[PDB]
Amino acid sequence: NPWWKKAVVYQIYPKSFKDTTGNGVGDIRGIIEKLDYIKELACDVIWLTPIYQSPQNDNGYDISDYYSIHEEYGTMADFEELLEEAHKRGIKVIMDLVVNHTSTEHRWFKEAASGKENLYRDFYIWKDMKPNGAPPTNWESKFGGSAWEFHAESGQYYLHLYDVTQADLNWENEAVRKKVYEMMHFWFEKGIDGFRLDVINVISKDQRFPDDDEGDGRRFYTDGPRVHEFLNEMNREVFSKYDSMTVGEMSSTTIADCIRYTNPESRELDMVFNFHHLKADYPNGEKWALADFDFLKLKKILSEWQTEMNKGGGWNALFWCNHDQPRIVSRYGDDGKYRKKSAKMLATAIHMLQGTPYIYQGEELGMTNPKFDDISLYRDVESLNMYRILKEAGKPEAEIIEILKAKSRDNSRTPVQWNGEENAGFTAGTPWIPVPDNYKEINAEEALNDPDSIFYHYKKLNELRKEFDIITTGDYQLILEDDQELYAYLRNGADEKLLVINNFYGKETEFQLPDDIDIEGYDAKVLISNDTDLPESFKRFTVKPYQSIVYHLAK
Ligand SMILES: [Mg+2]
Numbered sequence: 001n002p003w004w005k006k007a008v009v010y011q012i013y014p015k016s017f018k019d020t021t022g023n024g025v026g027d028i029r030g031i032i033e034k035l036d037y038i039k040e041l042a043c044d045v046i047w048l049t050p051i052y053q054s055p056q057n058d059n060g061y062d063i064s065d066y067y068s069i070h071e072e073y074g075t076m077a078d079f080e081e082l083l084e085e086a087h088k089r090g091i092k093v094i095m096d097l098v099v100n101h102t103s104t105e106h107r108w109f110k111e112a113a114s115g116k117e118n119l120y121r122d123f124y125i126w127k128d129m130k131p132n133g134a135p136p137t138n139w140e141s142k143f144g145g146s147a148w149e150f151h152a153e154s155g156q157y158y159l160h161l162y163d164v165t166q167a168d169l170n171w172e173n174e175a176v177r178k179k180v181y182e183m184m185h186f187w188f189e190k191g192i193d194g195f196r197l198d199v200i201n202v203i204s205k206d207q208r209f210p211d212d213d214e215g216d217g218r219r220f221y222t223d224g225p226r227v228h229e230f231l232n233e234m235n236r237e238v239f240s241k242y243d244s245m246t247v248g249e250m251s252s253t254t255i256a257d258c259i260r261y262t263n264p265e266s267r268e269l270d271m272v273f274n275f276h277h278l279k280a281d282y283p284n285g286e287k288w289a290l291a292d293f294d295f296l297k298l299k300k301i302l303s304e305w306q307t308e309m310n311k312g313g314g315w316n317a318l319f320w321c322n323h324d325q326p327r328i329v330s331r332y333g334d335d336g337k338y339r340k341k342s343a344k345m346l347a348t349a350i351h352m353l354q355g356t357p358y359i360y361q362g363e364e365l366g367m368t369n370p371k372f373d374d375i376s377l378y379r380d381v382e383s384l385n386m387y388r389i390l391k392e393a394g395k396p397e398a399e400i401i402e403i404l405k406a407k408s409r410d411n412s413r414t415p416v417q418w419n420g421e422e423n424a425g426f427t428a429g430t431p432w433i434p435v436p437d438n439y440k441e442i443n444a445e446e447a448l449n450d451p452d453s454i455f456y457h458y459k460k461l462n463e464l465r466k467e468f469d470i471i472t473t474g475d476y477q478l479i480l481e482d483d484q485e486l487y488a489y490l491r492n493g494a495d496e497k498l499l500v501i502n503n504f505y506g507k508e509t510e511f512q513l514p515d516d517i518d519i520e521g522y523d524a525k526v527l528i529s530n531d532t533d534l535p536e537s538f539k540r541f542t543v544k545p546y547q548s549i550v551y552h553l554a555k
Contacts (some may be wrong), residue, residue, distance in 0.1 A: 003530055004194075004245040004270055006472055007092070008462045009358045010043040013323040014051055014073055016415045017361055019427035026415070026426075028074035032082050035089055037444065041364055041455070042462035045092045045245070047196055049323060051079075052098075055105050057165045057324075061198065062103040064164075082190045092193035094245060097347055099180050100199050101166040109167050111157075113151055113374075125159040125170050126151075127209065137209050139217030147217065161202055161221065171203045171230055173424045184238045194245035197269070201227055201250045201257070223257045231261065231268040240267065247317050247356075248272045255304065259312035271315040277450055278325055281332075288386065288407050293332055295504055299309045299478065302353070306476035311352055318350050321360035327412045330369035338506055339366055340545045344457040344530035345502050345548035349487055350502045351461040352408045352550055359458060362416045365447050366454040369411045370436035373401055377434050383408040419445040460528055468527070468552070470496050479517065485509045486543065490517065495555040498527065499538065506545040522553040 018030025029053070038046060041162035050060035053068045058068070069076055102109060111120040127136035127148070136157050141164075148157035149164055159168045169176050171379050183483035184195070204224030212219055224411040239246055246361040248261060248269045258272050262306055279285070280301065281293035309316055320328035329335050333342030343366035351357050351519075375387050383404055390400045407409075410433060423431050424439035465471050474491030485505045491498040497519065501511055513519075524538055527550040535541035538551055 001472075002245075002270070003092075003243070004045070004356060006042045006465050007045045007356055009045040009047050009094070009356065010038050010041065011047050011049070011310040011319075011322070011358055011360045013049050013361060013413065015409060015432065016413050016426075018416065018418070019429065019431070022427065022429040023072070023428050024429045024431045025072055028069075028078040028082055032078070032085055035085055035091065039089045039091065040459070041359070043359060045094060045193070046086060046097060047094045047358070050096045050198075051097060053111050055103055055165065057103065058163045061098050062101075062105075062163065062166045063098055064105040065107070067113060067186060072177070087191070087515040092245070094194035094196060094247075095187060096198060096199075097184070097191050097195040099169060099469055100203050101160065101162060102103070104165045104167050113154060115154055116156070122173050122286040123170055123176050123204070124167050126154075127159070128156055137217060137220075138211045139220070158493060159205075159539065161199075169203075171205075172207065173227070174345065177230070177233065181234065181237045184234075188238065188242050191510060193243070194247075197246065197248045197394055198232070199251050200248045200269075201253055201261075203227060203230060218252060218381075222252050223254065227257075227264065228260055228268060232266065235267045244270075246270050246280045247320075250274050255308045255312075259314040262309070263312060264315040265483060267312070271317045273317045273319065274305065276305070278322075281309075288403065290403060290406055295484065295487075296482065298332075299481065302350075302487075303476070303478040303481075303489070303552050306354055306478075306550075310475055316353070316355035317358055318353050318355040319358035319360070319524075320346060320350060321358075321412060323360070323413055324409050325412060327367055327369050328363065329366050330411075332504070334396065334506055334546065335368040339368065340452075340454055340518040341397075341530050341548075342506075343454045344534045345504070345546050346526065347454070347461055348500065348530065348550060349502045349504075349550040350500060351465070352471065352489075352491065354472070354474070354491070357461075357465070360412065362412075363440055364458040365417060365444055365453050367412075367414075367417060367442060368438060369405060370434070371405050372408070372410070372434065372436070373405075375401075375404075377537075378408055378410050379413070379433050380408055380410040383410060404495040418445040419443050457528075464528060469493075470498060470552075474498060479514050480511075481508075485510060497522065499524075499551040499553060500548075501538075501543065501550075502548045503543045503546050506543060508542050511538075511541055511543050519553055523550045523555075524553050526550070527552040 014026045017026040019026050020029040029485050031427050051069050051073045052063045053065035054060050054063050108120045108123045111118050135146045139147040141147040143163045150157050160166050168208045201223050202221050204226040206220040218510050246269045249271050253274055260266055261269050261272050280298040281291050283291040329343040333346050387400050414433055415431050415435055417424035419425035420440045423433045426444055447453040470493040474493040477490045480486050487504055488501045530548045
């Protein structure tokens, strides 16, 4: 059984983790200083978002040199000391791998853009104007507008699925692939334990580059004709030579493809993230619009991914949070009265699923969205732009602010709140982004000194995954599918079950075990609960607001 199957991963966004230098920006030395904290949480993998040399046009996802570290974050010596101090504590480290595109400041692009005959020209994707003066395709960039950028000096457009200074690498080019693999070897040989592969399912483009009527063009590069081939090749050349863990981040993918990506027979990736459960509060798929989450759809989404991947032999990365997503307690939980209870409930809801769980820095503290009530507190360029545009269109100030409070991509980027000192102890300087005033009540020092804290609830969930094999091997069975408040399910094992019951809302409601649930001869014991008010009988009882209970049933 691979070491990653029962692992729990702690996601670190270094800019906002811990500043040890006083410049207001988190750094690698800060992570080192926190390894004992991460071990205390009982995570055994650390995942760092991009720390590579980069102009920082796109939050580090525009990489100008894969072999060195952004100076702000520290030195390569720091990094190697982090690998060494981590491994000594039994913690593995995986890196973020961004190889769909490079910065246009990368050596290869500067060379390639110089002319149609430069050696590196075909490292990127170039096409001519259409006769009608239109771009090569009508495909849209995910940052909006055309996915093609004209390069005057050479007379062609290069492709960018993402931002303008993020030029898509040409994966049809075997030369490019080999260079990527060499780069991957460099890091593995340095001693990292794996990679999360950023938007990896878009590297295979339809080489006929046709126009998209019915859409924005994503139909022509998402889970494309050669993605499985490329990943498997990457497996043979790189992943197969190390004791590694690889997780792919998928854009707009499908269950069928994710089964192929992660079934061990494919020799592609170990697991994948998909984001469908994090779109359950998008009205009509509009990412910036306000709405309450659709609970039944959420349950349906989680259950499909559980049962289908289980049947297909695939593996899910399990998570609620990212540097790009709202903090989960504010989003699907209650960040007021029931902040602690609902944070624990959400943690249990997803950790008791089949797969490998990911904790985003500060989630274990129940950090909330910061509720910044003024435009000067925000940093994310997309938020600043959105405020500018909505202001120009005459939306009132308070209404724009409400939108940013729910949707700004800064929301989970505020500094980790360590203690109740200045700037929550994140920095002795001025943080690059403000700390909200809740820090005095919400911080690690306070959580670590409260036996009933969210932090220790996560610790227990993390250790349970090591202690109870059914969390890894049990199937998944949804019950109470139509219930408007309860998310409940079973994990069925060999004369052993888990029954997990989560109230997703702040009202009392009844749980009754369905008649088809055959538990004859099983004894029940509480595995973990966020409430000491335990039912006389789990078979029928009144669930308290945001109550979360897991029963361990055995013969
Ligand atoms: Mg610093």
